[PDB]
């Protein structure tokens, strides 16, 4: 057996185990929100003693 083969032979399924791990990520989303204050109206009031 060659030294390179022995190095490959040294690694074993029980000897080396590979596991793939990922972190859950929420999908990116784009949303547009517009806010506009309540409508305002002009009011004119005249008060007199008789009224």
């Amino acid at each position: 057996h060659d030294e390179e083969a022995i190095k490959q032979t040294l690694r074993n399924k029980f000897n080396y185990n590979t596991r793939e791990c990922q972190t859950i990520n929420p999908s990116i989303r784009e949303r547009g929100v517009s806010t506009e204050p309540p409508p305002s109206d002009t009011i004119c009031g005249n008060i007199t003693q008789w009224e």
Partner: protein
């Protein structure tokens, strides 16, 4: 040819195994030489 073919299929199963153990497959190569002889027989069979 059929008898050689049955041995050839086993040799493949043994090879599936040698790779896992990184062991050099000298035995597999000997089996391959036998398989080559079988292949020559198979070629003759094909002609027949």
């Amino acid at each position: 040819e059929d008898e050689y073919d049955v041995k050839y299929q086993m040799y493949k199963i043994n090879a599936r195994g040698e790779n896992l153990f990184g062991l050099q497959n000298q035995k597999y190569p000997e089996l391959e030489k036998t398989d080559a002889e079988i292949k020559n027989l198979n070629k003759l069979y094909n002609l027949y």
